[PDB]
């Protein structure tokens with residue numbers, strides 16, 4: 559069972575602490591949501607240490623649809639409305655209109671261009687016009703309350719950054735197997751081993767926030 | 775120079791004929807746009823023969839942001855408005871709001887789910903509600919006139935399908951190098967060799983349409 563499979567990463571508190579420490583060191587982590595939800599593992603990286611090589615890894619190993627998780631304040635600062643008014647997607651994933659950096663990029667898709675666009679959007683001094691729309695980076699609005707309000711990877715990502723003392727912005731992308739099927743827990747653990755990436759779950763995060771009166 | 779590099783695929787007419795023949799056989803092709811434009815090569819597949827293995831190849835070898843090129847009529851039939859009203863992206867790429875199949879899929883990202891969503895959207899009997907919005911497939915509206923009106927991969931894709939006698943819908947995604955840089959003409963030719971994919975250019979297509987009074 560999943561809990562058993564993740565015992566080798568530690569108990570849930572340790573799984574969380576190790577994930578926060580990796581983010582502080584500028585490395586990436588792997589977050590699983592609930593098995594009854596998507597049952598998917600996302601590579602997560604902090605924006606402030608994001609490199610081209612980290613972006614290249616997400617693109618060649620994940621779905622390629624790399625999302626920027628932002629606070630509501632930061633999405634508002636950028637004037638990013640939701641992509642659609644009545645979002646009838648399954649999880650109601652909070653996609654804004656997509657974005658490209660307006661300067662410093664060419665077609666927008668190269669790993670470097672995506673990082674340039676991500677760092678431009680996430681800049682606390684960003685202004686709306688720094689971003690052309692549409693583009694090849696996909697922002698997601700994290701709910702206030704984080705994973706204590708919505709058990710999504712979006713909220714997990716921004717919560718991880720805050721809990722780690724980092725700028726509240728991170729990127730994510732779903733781990734995909736070579737044959738196009740989505741990575742399940744055994745493949746996610748194995749990929750974390752290869753790439754020295756801690757593995758944790760939203761459930762670990764909820765327990766942790768609800769054991770250390772953590773309001774972010 | 776590029777023209778020289780592509781002489782080994784034939785003269786421009788032959789490059790086009792070989793691309794149309796591969797599509798009819800259900801294989802994929804590689805389309806380059808103008809060197810002064812994006813200078814990028816897209817893997818293109820026809821929707822009607824699209825398989826999970828073909829979708830898995832685009833995801834692990836390309837940007838992962840897989841687009842469905844549709845006619846204006848078909849995008850209208852699906853009630854797909856442009857993602858943004860004032861599109862200030864560089865090429866004014868005609869992104870609609872993104873889509874997922876409403877039935878037959880789980881999270882939407884697996885290669886199989888994307889094909890399910892693509893085949894649902896492209897179905898000539900499709901209705902708007904067959905697609906949830908937003909999602910993980912990105913439709914693009916091809917301009918009337920095709921590449922004789924707009925020299926984009928979008929129009930190249932739908933034009934290729936029509937010229938080949940196929941249903942006017944195809945998918946595309948930009949060929950990406952392992953390190954995240956975008957594939958340039960030498961890498962595109964080499965990738966076409968490996969995967970037995972013809973290579974052609976929008977310029978080949980414009981010449982061809984303007985040498986065989988081809989109005990589609």
Ligand SMILES: O=C(CO)[C@H](O)[C@H](O)COP(=O)(O)O
Pocket residue numbers: 591596600623625649650651652709710711712713730732881910
């Ligand atoms: O759809 C996705 C991004 O395109 C992934 O499923 C991402 O994890 C969605 O976020 P969430 O888990 O918060 O709904």
Ligand SMILES: O=C(CO)[C@H](O)[C@H](O)COP(=O)(O)O
Pocket residue numbers: 665694807812816839841865866867868925926927928929946948
């Ligand atoms: O942006 C893209 C898809 O996301 C690619 O550049 C695609 O080729 C864009 O289409 P076009 O060449 O017609 O502008």
Ligand SMILES: [Mn+2]
Pocket residue numbers: 632680681682725726727
């Ligand atoms: Mn910020």
Ligand SMILES: [Mn+2]
Pocket residue numbers: 591596598600710711
């Ligand atoms: Mn998710």
Ligand SMILES: [Mn+2]
Pocket residue numbers: 848896897898941942943
């Ligand atoms: Mn059609």
Ligand SMILES: [Mn+2]
Pocket residue numbers: 807812814816926927
């Ligand atoms: Mn293009």
